[PDB]
């Protein structure tokens with residue numbers, strides 16, 4: 001039996017999966033060390049990350065050109081890839097071509113990890129947040145603009161339990177257990193949701209939320225997506241490529257409900273470089289935004305400023321989706337994994353391949369063919 | 370009369386040359402439009418940029434993932450590649466896969482162009498400077514931290530004739546006609562030469578220059594190089610990989626004379642991502658810094674913290690050199706062009722190839738084979 005695919009994650013030009021039996025595999029661009037195989041070569045097919053065999057990994061998360069993973073039983077976080085600005089969290093700027101433990105996080109109960117371009121954040125089981133990496137625009141939420149090579153606690157969240165965090169190029173977002181939404185970091189395109197285009201050095205609460213509490217948040221490069229308790233979808237920030245999905249190319253400075261999906265309950269969301277994906281509770285995947293390389297997955301190369309359903313063989317329902325910069329990954333109910341978009345770094349995982357504008361199955365990881 | 374290479378320039382992962390007959394060609398990574406051929410594909414061999422045939426281009430300059438060129442007779446500056454933050458100068462953020470004229474610069478007599486990661490500068494024949502692109506850390510020299518989608522004049526240089534400018538990832542430097550040296554922008558690794566680790570939003574004069582006037586300046590990603598009237602070489606900023614060249618790994622916050630080359634007169638300089646090149650008046654090329662991919666050109670893959678001479682067949686003298694992020698380009702007295710370092714995007718111009726750690730001849734552009 002082909003191992004169940006438990007988690008997928010996409011970076012700028014690479015792809016990572018966690019499979020049952022606790023094995024990690026990676027593919028795509030390898031030049032910065034983001035695949036973790038020791039060498040610097042691109043891999044066009046899923047390749048087992050041997051250094052993590054036996055380490056009981058339960059999650060993996062891609063940044064633009066780096067990757068983070070963690071083990072619950074080992075109480076360890078690992079990172080590898082481009083090391084500049086401290087994004088790997090080891091107290092230095094060195095690139096890593098094989099995983100190493102983030103010593104500062106050893107023994108800490110991790111709930112969730114998010115990775116942006118050059119900064120990362122971890123949420124603990126007690127709802128505290130630690131952040132590290134580039135901080136030139138306050139994206140670490142630490143109250144200044146100095147980069148951090150090691151994780152630091154966000155003191156601004158003292159007394160406020162955090163449920164999940166998200167990170168874009170140079171901005172950050174979070175939702176609390178009580179349903180509050182926050183933004184901070186680089187804010188020039190309205191992507192913090194605070195009603196202006198200025199940065200924040202500490203988390204600031206988003207007050208315009210359509211009267212709704214929020215359960216989920218995700219970040220694209222310069223846009224942000226959230227989901228409410230009623231399953232409504234909100235987008236804000238940059239829409240040069242229509243990635244907000246409102247049927248035009250206008251930016252929004254506060255969360256704006258995507259009315260076209262109002263009859264659906266959204267269960268998962270992902271933000272890409274200039275595109276966006278949302279998954280409904282009945283397993284339908286919608287994509288929109290930039291489609292130059294086919295990354296929307298709708299079988300053409302027209303940009304899309306409104307949500308369009310991504311179709312799969314036999315209409316099999318989708319269970320996970322993750323956006324890269326120029327590609328998209330998805331897992332279905334049948335335990336098939338699909339990829340589409342740009343394929344030049346091997347990130348689609350289907351062997352040497354032309355770009356694809358509709359879903360293509362990754363046979364190496366899938367039950368079907 | 371046989372085809373000669375007149376000018377070469379290296380970007381992060383691409384390479385561009387101007388040939389006799391006023392022909393522009395390019396090779397290497399194509400994904401962001403930086404090659405200018407209209408498509409997004411890598412080219413492993415030199416490819417003529419036909420859209421500029423007949424435009425009488427006289428110079429080309431690569432940024433990380435974009436390219437600029439200009440024509441005297443046409444009084445036109447052109448740009449193409451990744452468009453974010455306004456680095457192409459057209460008053461919008463659109464990528465370009467084909468050269469477009471920078472309307473704001475039409476009819477201006479151009480002396481020199483410099484390109485960083487996300488910002489560019491142009492010096493006019495009267496010694497004025499215009500800048501455009503990313504400005505988050507003050508690198509445009511305009512007194513603020515707001516990006517500019519079009520060229521703007523640096524008013525700080527009113528009454529001060531600028532000779533040449535240079536741009537790194539997020540910083541900028543300049544020398545005046547009477548030999549003063551300036552720095553501005555992101556300054557966290559001491560790379561401005563001002564004695565601290567703090568950014569500047571407007572040009573600030575470097576006061577500790579060994580009592581010497583400077584004739585030229587160049588920038589690497591986070592380091593800076595200058596040459597005095599007496600041909601002495603100075604480096605400052607980041608030396609994590611030994612790219613300052615002083616035989617150790619210490620950062621310098623003010624210019625520091627590279628003593629090992631004191632008996633040579635330096636004629637040309639270039640800064641890469643994490644490596645450096647300097648050429649003597651006798652045609653000897655020296656390289657140092659990060660050498661993971663062989664980009665120092667000395668026949669191994671060990672980093673070099675002191676200058677080592679790059680050797681060429683029959684000891685032919687070098688006349689031009691340009692550093693990319695992971696590769697290096699050079700032209701010799703025999704009108705041969707050589708390349709070395711990372712080759713995975715086709716940036717060496719030698720057809721499909723493994724990485725190279727010593728100079729390899731580009732047959733398409735050379736007399737010898």
Ligand SMILES: [Mg+2]
Nearest residue numbers: 012064065434
């Ligand atoms: Mg990149």
Ligand SMILES: [Mg+2]
Nearest residue numbers: 009059060061
């Ligand atoms: Mg995850």
Ligand SMILES: [Mg+2]
Nearest residue numbers: 142143144146
């Ligand atoms: Mg601090």
Ligand SMILES: [Mg+2]
Nearest residue numbers: 344345410411
């Ligand atoms: Mg290829």
Ligand SMILES: [Mg+2]
Nearest residue numbers: 405406407408
């Ligand atoms: Mg073409």
Ligand SMILES: [Mg+2]
Nearest residue numbers: 511512513515
């Ligand atoms: Mg201004």
Ligand SMILES: [Mg+2]
Nearest residue numbers: 588589640641
């Ligand atoms: Mg440079």
Ligand SMILES: [Mg+2]
Nearest residue numbers: 615617618619
């Ligand atoms: Mg000493």
Ligand SMILES: [Mg+2]
Nearest residue numbers: 639640691692
């Ligand atoms: Mg250079």
Ligand SMILES: [Mg+2]
Nearest residue numbers: 042712713714
């Ligand atoms: Mg290859």
Ligand SMILES: [Mg+2]
Nearest residue numbers: 029031345714
């Ligand atoms: Mg690449």
